[PDB]
Design a protein around this ligand. Structure first.
Ligand SMILES: *[C@@H]1O[C@H](CO)[C@@H](O[C@@H]2O[C@H](CO)[C@@H](O)[C@H](O)[C@H]2NC(C)=O)[C@H](O)[C@H]1NC(C)=O
Ligand SMILES: *[C@@H]1O[C@H](CO)[C@@H](O[C@@H]2O[C@H](CO)[C@@H](O)[C@H](O)[C@H]2NC(C)=O)[C@H](O)[C@H]1NC(C)=O
Ligand SMILES: *[C@@H]1O[C@H](CO)[C@@H](O[C@@H]2O[C@H](CO)[C@@H](O)[C@H](O)[C@H]2NC(C)=O)[C@H](O)[C@H]1NC(C)=O
Ligand SMILES: *[C@@H]1O[C@H](CO)[C@@H](O[C@@H]2O[C@H](CO)[C@@H](O)[C@H](O)[C@H]2NC(C)=O)[C@H](O)[C@H]1NC(C)=O
Ligand SMILES: *[C@@H]1O[C@H](CO)[C@@H](O[C@@H]2O[C@H](CO)[C@@H](O)[C@H](O)[C@H]2NC(C)=O)[C@H](O)[C@H]1NC(C)=O
Ligand SMILES: *[C@@H]1O[C@H](CO)[C@@H](O[C@@H]2O[C@H](CO)[C@@H](O)[C@H](O)[C@H]2NC(C)=O)[C@H](O)[C@H]1NC(C)=O
Ligand SMILES: *[C@@H]1O[C@H](CO)[C@@H](O[C@@H]2O[C@H](CO)[C@@H](O)[C@H](O)[C@H]2NC(C)=O)[C@H](O)[C@H]1NC(C)=O
Ligand SMILES: *[C@@H]1O[C@H](CO)[C@@H](O[C@@H]2O[C@H](CO)[C@@H](O)[C@H](O)[C@H]2NC(C)=O)[C@H](O)[C@H]1NC(C)=O
Ligand SMILES: CC(=O)N[C@@H]1[C@@H](O)[C@H](O)[C@@H](CO)O[C@H]1O
Ligand SMILES: CC(=O)N[C@@H]1[C@@H](O)[C@H](O)[C@@H](CO)O[C@H]1O
Ligand SMILES: CC(=O)N[C@@H]1[C@@H](O)[C@H](O)[C@@H](CO)O[C@H]1O
Ligand SMILES: CC(=O)N[C@@H]1[C@@H](O)[C@H](O)[C@@H](CO)O[C@H]1O
Ligand SMILES: CC(=O)N[C@@H]1[C@@H](O)[C@H](O)[C@@H](CO)O[C@H]1O
Ligand SMILES: *[C@@H]1O[C@H](CO)[C@@H](O)[C@H](O)[C@H]1NC(C)=O
Ligand SMILES: *[C@@H]1O[C@H](CO)[C@@H](O)[C@H](O)[C@H]1NC(C)=O
Ligand SMILES: *[C@@H]1O[C@H](CO)[C@@H](O)[C@H](O)[C@H]1NC(C)=O
Ligand SMILES: *[C@@H]1O[C@H](CO)[C@@H](O)[C@H](O)[C@H]1NC(C)=O
Ligand SMILES: *[C@@H]1O[C@H](CO)[C@@H](O)[C@H](O)[C@H]1NC(C)=O
Ligand SMILES: *[C@@H]1O[C@H](CO)[C@@H](O)[C@H](O)[C@H]1NC(C)=O
Ligand SMILES: *[C@@H]1O[C@H](CO)[C@@H](O)[C@H](O)[C@H]1NC(C)=O
Ligand SMILES: *[C@@H]1O[C@H](CO)[C@@H](O)[C@H](O)[C@H]1NC(C)=O
Ligand SMILES: *[C@@H]1O[C@H](CO)[C@@H](O)[C@H](O)[C@H]1NC(C)=O
Ligand SMILES: *[C@@H]1O[C@H](CO)[C@@H](O)[C@H](O)[C@H]1NC(C)=O
Lengths: 480, 478, 161, 292
């Protein structure tokens, strides 16, 4: 009971919160993750009872910051994450005269003095129905040509059978898009029609297959100009080069990267097939639209203060000039309900338009390229991503680089040699205790400190924290 | 006919979207011109045709085991992006819209409370935020920058976008033809407030932005304006997309000629193409349509005996006039409330579009963009702001690659048991000899120790060819 | 006086209307009170009206072979303020419209689902505000803690920690 | 009030402050890496060295000006509290939302006293002196007036909640791309070249402290796009050719450090006859005095 102080009145056990007080739950003293929200930091089954607790925000981890210590990963994991965004709705259209005014010329002659309200609501719903197809074309119709995969799948160990369309299945869908269509589940009444979308469900999938074939074949050059093909290890090597990792890492770990990619792609179908409400962002759109239509039909049964809600029943036993004011209450109540429906559909269409603009932005900046912006295409350093078609939406499979298996190294800002301060060209100076090396920042790869990976500026008396080591000059064994 | 079958009523064709009469069904597909629904679109060969839309030309790119396509040329191109930022600052009067000059219905209007005050406050908030949208988009410079009096930009011509001193309004030809392309109520108590920034001041803001970017690059959007030679600015804008700057210094005349041709095509495309200013014509048409139905809803009776207030106050005494007065006030009040609701929903969309236009000004005009398909199709270099009536036009100058060769590659080169990886660019080969070139242009170089780096040995990479990596140290010692 | 001529009772005619009580000056300032159509509005014991000045003019010395390389810099901290949530309010329709009266409530139930639609919409707003706050602030999987020794190389964080 | 209740937020101000404290400790002790994967520790000079390296400034500029950069940062951080204490209406974006919500609530309370054509506005008086079959329409006018005012308030809160949801999506994007990393987007995380950002808890909002790199003092120099040497044209590998009047130097674009033009600082492309407006100078090959 929120907003009461329960010294006044099931009554099992009573705890006083700041969000009211809660009856029937035991207040434990240890904190967990918030499972059922209540309010004011209190959340709510464990140990044969419903428990109530102050939430735990996360596991506390004080990372070992130090004077001259750095942490660089010696390995990585490649994780694929899903993001689900709705792009469109059902294009509903309401005939106002048939809706408030079913087959009665008496209400029609009573309705012509209300003016242009019904064609205003029809214009608003028509603009909504034009806006949904514009949203779908702005999300999916971004490639100028339809690209096709090669008949041989020689991608260097990278397996795309879960993502590319399968000709054995009808309407040319992937297993992931097929399970999305099986996990998203979708009549004709008085005055209500549902306009079909301009882009059909088998043919939005042709745009997604064209984008997938163009991405896998050509990198991002099809999004810029003509589609310039590339081997897929070379494509993933320069996508590794876009996030500060040198190209030799994939060329020395290519089978591990291919196996991690295939395992992470195969875990996606199992994760969104075994996790409930992962497609809730698509399910709530269909549920809100169908519930708004069900409320719109259900407000025809309201009397609005009249003797009955049936227009022929209140005409069949009453005179015309009291049946006039009995009809007119139903006209103003059903017209107010119809304007409420059109207003809520306009606000929901604005929300769907904002989500579709976000989906088209994510399609352009994750699918047609590689994003340097953090957490816009998944958690981790973004490599590449995969669009998948969905009922009234789009699903992105963000393939991201995630570091793992770190080790401490003792670092320094600069290294003094012969009175000169050496700074790293790409990367940092690290040490394991005895010797100093130069590594790149995102991967542990120790190298001998030379003059072609360091640069010289200034002296050693100006840099705070400079250490002393030697720098190997490559001219020395030829001079010796 | 939308929601029916083709069993109830010169040629009748059944579609999935309904029953279509008057269009011939043609098997082969075309690009969609008039949308119907469910993939069917609809004049060609003096008749109306009906077809499934074509999804673009279909080509299969020759994916190979070991080949990259690398361009030998490029076409620099200018695309237009047109975004609305504002609407007309409309404001109505409550008692003059609902009643007018009648205190004996003003007393019944005071029985409804603050229904005047809520709609006036909402329309006032819209009229304040429409100036905030224009200020947030155009007012991004601290200082008003001016062009040099001579125009020696290395070959680049900017007379289409710089303002003309012979013009009495101090506008560019592109901004003037944008002003001459769109075409545009104040009678019963509804007013149109003028904007805070006039068109000359908005053109002065865009001229300050234009002179600032051609004089400084991206430095004036960050800090103080640091001057640049403009070929060196375009070379440093090539250097941000992956092309080395030597390509511009060898092809500067071709870049200037293609840029001037692509800029001169913009005025011809905006003059010739019908409904080019669609997103700015649509907001003016929507505001005019809402204003027209706001005026036209006074002619409705709303159950009263006459729509005009003056004759029913002239022919009924108040204790039976007030039944008609209450119906007229209720109908006009909920009509005005409907208008304010649709104007708030439209003003949220205009606010989102103006936020997008200010964001596109900030990282297309004031800087260089690495997020692709956000500042035009292709590799973005820079863009030009152009003022527009209740809108802004971006002239996105992008780098689009031209014709290419298909080559043959290898990801690593083994030399004396050591695997050599390229620092920038990839290895290519035209059949016999191997070269190092950059990715976005074919500039083949001899494989040296300078442009390649070594890591590991030759048993870890799955495809390696064997060549000689030539260092200058052995001939300059021998 | 909005959108009229100055013929219907100092006097200054603007495009936005007839301005009475503000003197017109020739020179321009940065805008203080917005009037409209480039006019803005206290200085020298009176209310002034002026044309807007968009800034200070700066002809940057363009040459075909001249660079301005910065020899020095500054480190600037700016504040950006963004709202993320509002107050989770809710109304009861029966107690608001129809307080403690079943003889109004029996005719309020004749209107259908109007006032449970409003409750459902405000419930969705109140759910949406917590989703907004969690989406903005809850972006870490772990709660991180600063070390007790503030050896940050000369950088002071006590105003921020 | 009568029917109006205010639900408290799920996250209290201590928990929002602990989220911002976790974000601040994460960004101070690890840079950008805690938003990507695990929080990997780094010294804060080397963190600021990579954040200088992201905007075209080499790390040696910070490593020779670390005390000046720390003093400028501490002065600019200490100016924030003084500016927020002495400048009114800086928090107007947080003031207007609670002003609009409380003002809409006060309007919803004040519309209860409206008549809408009734003989009195309070329900109990028009109930208590009238019979029900004559009083039903007398109730029903107040019913439809209060219902129209309530659905007006719900429509206004829906449009305002859409606006606050758009602002919260912008704030979450600015958190993820200014706090959890370094952004190359111009004017997205403050005026200037963005280094790093600081979230701060606010009542119904968030305040970002964007640390930016702004250049201060510039000098004129004469350029050349290439340097001629024995028929070859040398183009800058990184930075610009500058001259003080007599001798030519290579410096980076965002800071003035002149170095001698060497063969490891430029690259050879083509000849001098194709590039317009280039000068003649000497590019010194470093191995020649080593063998000589
Ligand atoms: C890096 O080394 C430091 C110290 O050498 C480790 O920090 C210690 O972590 C344990 C874990 O609970 C604490 O009990 C110690 O007090 C910490 N010591 C110091 C000096 O902070 C740190 O765990 C190492 N990091 C990794 C990834 O191995
Ligand atoms: C890509 O992954 C799929 C999924 O494992 C592979 O399909 C399997 O193929 C083997 C035969 O090689 C069958 O025994 C399995 O039953 C298949 N699994 C499923 C789930 O159908 C597919 O072969 C892989 N592609 C390549 C080129 O190896
Ligand atoms: C690079 O070579 C490939 C194959 O050698 C070319 O692909 C063929 O191009 C011809 C052009 O007349 C077509 O008729 C063939 O059908 C293509 N074959 C395949 C399998 O696609 C490719 O076009 C060449 N690239 C360039 C730019 O010339
Ligand atoms: C790159 O493309 C340009 C055109 O985009 C080529 O320039 C043309 O060259 C022909 C050669 O006879 C001239 O007739 C044309 O007038 C040129 N056009 C322009 C706009 O200058 C150029 O030759 C191409 N270069 C390469 C190496 O293919
Ligand atoms: C920059 O472009 C403008 C526009 O194309 C050039 O103006 C043209 O000048 C010629 C004279 O040689 C006239 O015949 C054209 O009619 C002009 N065009 C227009 C639209 O008026 C201008 O000459 C160019 N600047 C330079 C230095 O070449
Ligand atoms: C770059 O700018 C800073 C700040 O303006 C200069 O630091 C000042 O230097 C003067 C004299 O050297 C001192 O009196 C001030 O106290 C310093 N201010 C601060 C905040 O440290 C710095 O000298 C400039 N660099 C150059 C090379 O001129
Ligand atoms: C970091 O900056 C803060 C600024 O407040 C310094 O704290 C102040 O120190 C002086 C010196 O004793 C005290 O008089 C003030 O009362 C302190 N202010 C506060 C708010 O505590 C702090 O000393 C600085 N840290 C270092 C290491 O210099
Ligand atoms: C670079 O050179 C230009 C021109 O030689 C300088 O611009 C002059 O600045 C002074 C400052 O008041 C003006 O009075 C002159 O009229 C300007 N000259 C021109 C031609 O506009 C500029 O100041 C120099 N830059 C620096 C940093 O000194
Ligand atoms: C059921 C239970 O253990 N309740 C404890 C209480 O006994 C203790 O006094 C308090 C303070 O620590 O915390 C809680
Ligand atoms: C503590 C440690 O790992 N030290 C090693 C050392 O044993 C080894 O000889 C050297 C490479 O030569 O690298 C370092
Ligand atoms: C910390 C340290 O040992 N620094 C040394 C210094 O003592 C010595 O005088 C100088 C000359 O070689 O080299 C460095
Ligand atoms: C509904 C539809 O698509 N096609 C129908 C078909 O099913 C039906 O058998 C035929 C006979 O009238 O009329 C048509
Ligand atoms: C592809 C290829 O020719 N690889 C050769 C291999 O055949 C040869 O045995 C080796 C030296 O023994 O050098 C390498
Ligand atoms: C709630 O009741 C307790 C019990 O007396 C009292 O101490 C407390 O002050 C009350 N709080 C409020 C807000 O009335
Ligand atoms: C990196 O992790 C993978 C886990 O799949 C493991 O197989 C591999 O050996 C690890 N590499 C190193 C160098 O530890
Ligand atoms: C480590 O801390 C000591 C003081 O305890 C200091 O003198 C030294 O300079 C620090 N080292 C580095 C690299 O900052
Ligand atoms: C169109 O195609 C279908 C099947 O492809 C065929 O049966 C029909 O005759 C074609 N129509 C015309 C006019 O060629
Ligand atoms: C190229 O094709 C051959 C045979 O078709 C195959 O053995 C080899 O693994 C392929 N890949 C390379 C060289 O990367
Ligand atoms: C106001 O009246 C004067 C008198 O004729 C006229 O010259 C002027 O144009 C009028 N101004 C407007 C804005 O109507
Ligand atoms: C403004 O300038 C005009 C033009 O000379 C002059 O007549 C007038 O007196 C000036 N007004 C003021 C207030 O300076
Ligand atoms: C220009 O630089 C050279 C090289 O250091 C120096 O000798 C000369 O004095 C400088 N001239 C001026 C005017 O600064
Ligand atoms: C710069 O302009 C001058 C005109 O005084 C000219 O002599 C010189 O050749 C031009 N330089 C370049 C590189 O265009
Ligand atoms: C540069 O050298 C070439 C050939 O030695 C000569 O023709 C040219 O005039 C020189 N440039 C200048 C500015 O003297």
């Amino acid at each position: 009971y929120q907003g009461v102080n329960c010294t006044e009145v099931t009554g099992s056990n009573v705890f006083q919160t700041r969000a009211g007080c809660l009856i029937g739950a035991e207040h434990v003293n240890n904190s967990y993750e918030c499972d059922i929200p209540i309010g004011a930091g209190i959340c709510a089954v464990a140990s044969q009872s419903i428990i109530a607790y102050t939430m735990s925000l996360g596991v506390e981890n004080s990372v070992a910051y130090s004077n001259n210590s750095i942490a660089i990963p010696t390995n990585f994991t490649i994780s694929v994450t899903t993001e689900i965004l709705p792009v469109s709705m059902t294009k509903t259209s309401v005939d106002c005269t048939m809706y408030i005014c079913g087959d009665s010329t008496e209400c029609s002659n009573l309705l012509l003095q209300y003016g242009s309200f019904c064609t205003q609501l029809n214009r608003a719903l028509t603009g909504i129905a034009v806006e949904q197809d514009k949203n779908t074309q702005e999300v999916f119709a971004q490639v100028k040509q339809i690209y096709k995969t090669p008949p041989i799948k020689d991608f260097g160990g990278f397996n795309f059978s879960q993502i590319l369309p399968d000709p054995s299945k009808p309407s040319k869908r992937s297993p992931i898009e097929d399970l999305l269509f099986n996990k998203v589940t979708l009549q004709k009444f008085n005055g209500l029609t549902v306009l079909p979308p301009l882009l059909t469900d088998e043919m939005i999938a042709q745009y997604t297959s064209a984008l997938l074939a163009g991405t896998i074949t050509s990198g991002w050059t099809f999004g810029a100009g003509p589609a310039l093909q590339i081997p897929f290890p070379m494509q993933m090597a320069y996508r590794f080069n876009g996030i500060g990792v040198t190209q030799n890492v994939l060329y020395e770990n290519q089978k591990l990267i291919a196996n991690q990619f295939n395992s992470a792609i195969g875990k996606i179908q199992d994760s969104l097939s075994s996790t409930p409400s992962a497609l809730g962002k698509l399910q709530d759109v269909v549920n809100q639209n169908a519930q708004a239509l069900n409320t719109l039909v259900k407000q025809l049964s309201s009397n609005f203060g009249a003797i009955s809600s049936v227009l022929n029943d209140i005409l069949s036993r009453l005179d015309p000039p009291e049946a006039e004011v009995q009809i007119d209450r139903l006209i103003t109540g059903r017209l107010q309900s119809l304007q409420t429906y059109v207003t809520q559909q306009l606000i929901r269409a604005a929300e769907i338009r904002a989500s579709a603009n976000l989906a088209a932005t994510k399609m352009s900046e994750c699918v047609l390229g590689q994003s340097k912006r953090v957490d816009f295409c998944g958690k981790g350093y973004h490599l590449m991503s995969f669009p998948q078609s969905a009922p009234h939406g789009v699903v992105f499979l963000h393939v991201t680089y995630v570091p793992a298996q770190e080790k401490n190294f003792t670092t320094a800002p600069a290294i003094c040699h012969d009175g000169k301060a050496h700074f790293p060209r790409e990367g940092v100076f690290v040490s394991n205790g005895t010797h100093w090396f130069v590594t790149q920042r995102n991967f542990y790869e120790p190298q001998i400190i030379t003059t072609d990976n360091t640069f010289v500026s200034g002296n050693c008396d100006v840099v705070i924290g400079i250490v002393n080591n030697t720098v190997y000059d490559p001219l020395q064994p030829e001079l010796d | 006919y939308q929601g029916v079958n083709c069993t109830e009523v010169s040629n009748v064709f059944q579609t999935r979207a309904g029953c279509l009469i008057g269009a011939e069904h043609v098997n082969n597909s075309y690009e969609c011109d008039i949308p119907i629904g469910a993939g069917i679109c609809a004049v060609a060969s003096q008749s109306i045709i009906a077809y499934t839309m074509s999804l673009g030309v279909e080509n299969s790119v020759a994916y190979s085991n070991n080949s990259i396509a690398i361009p030998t040329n490029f076409t620099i191109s200018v695309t237009t992006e047109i975004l609305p930022v504002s609407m007309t600052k409309t404001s109505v009067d409550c008692t003059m819209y609902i009643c007018g000059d009648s205190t004996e219905c003003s007393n019944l209007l005071l029985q409804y409370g603050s229904f005047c005050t809520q709609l006036n406050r909402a329309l006032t908030g819209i009229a304040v935020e429409q100036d905030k949208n224009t200020q947030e988009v155009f007012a991004q410079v601290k200082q008003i920058y001016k062009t040099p009096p001579i125009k020696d930009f290395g070959g680049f011509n900017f007379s289409q976008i710089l303002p003309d001193p012979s013009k009495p309004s101090k506008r560019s030809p592109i901004e003037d033809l944008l002003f001459n392309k769109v075409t545009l109520q104040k009678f019963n108590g509804l007013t149109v407030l003028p904007p805070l920034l006039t068109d000359e001041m908005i053109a002065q803001y865009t001229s300050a932005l234009l002179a600032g970017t051609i004089t400084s690059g991206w430095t004036f959007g960050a800090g103080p304006a640091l001057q640049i030679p403009f070929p060196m600015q375009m070379a440093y804008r090539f250097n941000g997309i992956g092309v080395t700057q030597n390509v511009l210094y060898e092809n500067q005349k071709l870049i200037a000629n293609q840029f001037n041709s692509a800029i001169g095509k913009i005025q011809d495309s905006l003059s010739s193409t019908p409904s080019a200013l669609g997103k700015l014509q649509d907001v003016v048409n929507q505001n005019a349509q809402a204003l027209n139905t706001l005026v036209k809803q006074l002619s409705s009776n709303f159950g009263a005996i006459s729509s005009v207030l003056n004759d029913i106050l002239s022919r009924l005494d108040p204790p039976e006039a007030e039944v008609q007065i209450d119906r007229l006030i209720t109908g006009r009040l909920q009509s005005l409330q409907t208008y304010v609701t649709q104007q708030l929903i439209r003003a949220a969309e205009i606010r989102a579009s103006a936020n997008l236009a200010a964001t596109k000004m900030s990282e297309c005009v004031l800087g260089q963009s690495k997020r692709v398909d956000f500042c035009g199709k292709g590799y973005h270099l820079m863009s030009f702001p152009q003022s527009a009536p209740h809108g802004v036009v971006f002239l996105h100058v992008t780098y689009v690659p031209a014709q290419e060769k298909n080559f043959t590659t290898a990801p690593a080169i083994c030399h004396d048991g050591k695997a050599h990886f390229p620092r920038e660019g990839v290895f290519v080969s035209n059949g016999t000899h191997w070269f190092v070139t950059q990715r976005n242009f074919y500039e083949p170089q001899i494989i040296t120790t300078d442009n390649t780096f070594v890591s590991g040995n030759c048993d870890v990479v799955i495809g390696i060819v064997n060549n000689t990596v030539y260092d200058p140290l052995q001939p300059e010692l021998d």
